């Protein structure tokens, strides 16, 4: 009955698209620590009142593995890692000839009394200096042990940021105007699909930039069951991330007590290295519970019986790899810990203060994380105390080759990606473009 075009503005309709996002962070230490590597001096602040508007009757299909927010977090951290330490001391002329012996006692550690040539405050005058460093930082070449540093090969090394916290804080992501982040606060997920109770947020969860392999440290813990993130599962070959229901607390210490040794490379520039270890020679010492973990594993083996066929043979340890890839490599208090994933996969089971559990702990200072073929970073030692106050927020698994059928499908931790580490955080997120213009016909028109 006389249909006429009517123009409507502010129509609540979205279109699936990806845009450039930005920071949202609360005031941390404020006085003492002012700029940590991620937040820096000037980070976009967060609002104490987020848009918690839940949309009934909306079953929007979320893409877990094909989310474009994950790739944004990947590029932001590395670009920031290259930026950070740029104005700092270049260790380009530091790499020289290295002659050494072992310790004063025949192995009763993993440190070597090295000697070398370093250009002092004056360029013309050269001084032979002795300094400490951890194992794997140097590689052999030749009565006296004659070797070289691992950096010269691969990349130009620079000294890392002084008094800058290399520990994460809640970094929320804010989408710009005319765009919204769809929040998925749904109970279960089958590796991407249609949801139940889709929400609309302009500010995301307190996502901490996780810097680790094997185990996940911060973040979302979806309750009552362990969530299986499936990028891909039918084919063993692809990586599988698993969200935990309840947190498994993990202590990390380093009873290696080190002093401060500063040697100037040319004019102004100051290089800080490991001084002297006060006390007995000992491993880092992370520590974990025996029974708590067993209890968490209890539902892991039970869930895999439902996902994978029957009770087929399924156990083994991290296969091959370099130190950083196959070990639980993580930042704690400053230094990088390389603890073992062997006592975990030691349990073979089919049918569905605290205890002393530790792993083969090793320290490393030469670190060009995510394979920095341009700018390499030297981790500075931390004088004294080493504490943890961290968590287990998930894990990363792998395949069992390409076996046809069979009864043997042994699974181990072989997840070699940093993107999948934030896929246990951005699983519930999907950016959309808002279309406020709407055209709908109805019995009404305009006149003169």
């Amino acid at each position: 009955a006389k249909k006429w075009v009517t123009v409507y503005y502010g129509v609540p309709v979205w279109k699936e698209a990806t845009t450039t996002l930005f920071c949202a962070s609360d005031a941390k230490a404020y006085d003492t620590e002012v700029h940590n590597v991620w937040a820096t001096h000037a980070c976009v602040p967060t609002d104490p009142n987020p848009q918690e508007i839940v949309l009934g009757n909306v079953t929007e299909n979320f893409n877990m593995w094909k989310n474009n927010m994950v790739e944004q977090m990947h590029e932001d951290i590395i670009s920031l890692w290259d930026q950070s330490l740029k104005p700092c001391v270049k260790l380009t002329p530091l790499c020289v000839t290295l002659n050494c012996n072992n310790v004063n006692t025949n192995n009763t550690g993993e440190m070597k009394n090295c000697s070398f040539n370093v250009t002092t405050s004056i360029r013309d005058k050269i001084k032979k200096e002795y300094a400490l460093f951890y194992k794997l930082d140097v590689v052999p070449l030749e009565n006296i042990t004659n070797y070289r540093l691992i950096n010269c090969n691969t990349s130009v090394i620079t000294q890392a940021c002084p008094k800058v916290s290399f520990e994460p804080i809640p970094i929320h992501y804010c989408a710009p105007a005319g765009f919204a982040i769809l929040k998925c606060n749904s109970k279960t997920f089958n590796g991407s699909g249609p949801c139940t109770n889709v929400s609309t947020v302009q500010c995301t969860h307190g996502i901490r930039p996780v810097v680790s392999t094997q185990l996940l440290l911060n973040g979302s813990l979806a309750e009552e069951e362990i969530v299986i993130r499936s990028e891909n599962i039918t084919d063993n070959a692809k990586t599988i991330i698993v969200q935990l229901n309840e947190a498994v607390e993990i202590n990390c210490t380093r009873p290696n007590n080190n002093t401060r040794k500063s040697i100037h490379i040319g004019p102004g520039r100051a290089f800080y290295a490991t001084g002297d270890i006060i006390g007995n020679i000992r491993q880092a010492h992370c520590n974990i519970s025996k029974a708590r973990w067993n209890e968490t594993l209890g539902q892991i083996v039970a869930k895999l019986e439902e996902q994978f066929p029957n009770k087929t043979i399924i156990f083994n340890h991290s296969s091959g790899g370099d130190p950083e890839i196959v070990t639980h490599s993580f930042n704690c208090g400053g230094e990088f810990f390389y603890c073992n994933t062997t006592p975990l996969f030691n349990s073979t089971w089919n049918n569905t203060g605290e205890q002393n559990i530790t792993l083969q702990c090793r320290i490393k200072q030469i670190i060009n994380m995510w394979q920095g073929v341009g700018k390499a970073m030297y981790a500075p030692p931390i004088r004294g105390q080493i504490r943890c106050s961290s968590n287990i927020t998930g894990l990363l698994l792998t395949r069992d080759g390409g076996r046809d059928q069979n009864g043997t499908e042994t699974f181990r931790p072989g997840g070699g990606n940093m993107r999948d580490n934030w896929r246990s955080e951005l699983y519930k997120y999907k950016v959309v473009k808002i279309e406020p213009l709407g055209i709908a016909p109805t019995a009404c028109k305009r006149r003169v």
Binding site: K3, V11, P12, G56, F179, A180, L437, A440, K445
Partner: protein, 136 residues
């Protein structure tokens, strides 16, 4: 009723509250304070590039309402007839059944041809008739 708090609800209840969907659309919970001594960091570049894309999505539709005589309000009708070939459903039927959500997926196709026709009957014809009709 909340930002997009009417998207779930039918077109009739969606047209009931559509001002909030445009209110929190620009400076709501995303604007903020917008606070080494330099602002050329990774967060500074990301916020200003997003600001350009923020206005771009508003101005594209803002220009259209301005060239339709619908600029003055949220909801304003036009002197454009509906060609039955585009949609065959009853006016009252989509308003309590189909919802804006599916409805946008129906028009999006002829949407550019609709915008082309909306410009002439309501502005290129109606406002151009005024030139002679204003003084008589």
């Amino acid at each position: 009723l909340g930002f997009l708090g009417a998207a779930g609800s039918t077109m009739g209840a969606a047209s009931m509250a559509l001002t909030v969907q445009a209110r929190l659309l620009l400076s709501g919970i995303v604007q903020q304070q917008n606070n080494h001594m330099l602002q050329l960091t990774v967060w500074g570049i990301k916020q200003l590039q997003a600001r350009v894309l923020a206005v771009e999505r508003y101005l594209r539709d803002q220009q259209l309402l301005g060239i339709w005589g619908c600029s003055g309000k949220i909801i304003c009708c036009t002197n454009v007839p509906w060609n039955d070939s585009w949609s065959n459903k009853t006016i009252n039927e989509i308003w309590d059944n189909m919802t804006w959500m599916q409805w946008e997926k129906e028009i999006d196709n002829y949407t550019q041809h609709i915008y082309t026709l909306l410009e002439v009957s309501q502005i290129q014809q109606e406002k151009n008739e005024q030139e002679l009709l204003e003084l008589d």
